[PDB]
Design a binder for these strands. Structure first.
Length: 52
DNA sequence: CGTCGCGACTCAGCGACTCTTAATCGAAGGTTAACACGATGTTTCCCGCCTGTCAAGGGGCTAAGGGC
């Protein structure tokens, strides 16, 4: 599930890096963190394996 | 005196609704251009009309006490 979240984050970073230039760019400014923690939250929030 | 030109034929094949009956505990995670007038509501007081106090005054009715 973290690999799925990382694939989503990679898609987001690929969609966002085309707009923001890489030369003189603020570090880690295009990498998102919502789908990273959202995947583990769903895994521990309402997953069938983490049900109880 | 054979077949094939030309026709149906039923056979396959492909899609598709339910999972008893009561019950063991409540919610549940992300997606990230910038600005501008305008017309459109939102929210405060402010007087208008009116509603509700208790009081003041009084009289009128009821009743109780005293005298013949």
């Amino acid at each position: 599930q973290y690999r799925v979240g990382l694939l989503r984050m990679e898609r987001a970073i690929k969609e966002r890096m085309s707009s923001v230039d890489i030369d003189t760019v603020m570090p880690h400014d295009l990498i998102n963190a919502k789908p990273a923690a959202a995947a583990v939250r769903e895994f521990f929030g309402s997953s069938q394996l983490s049900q109880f």
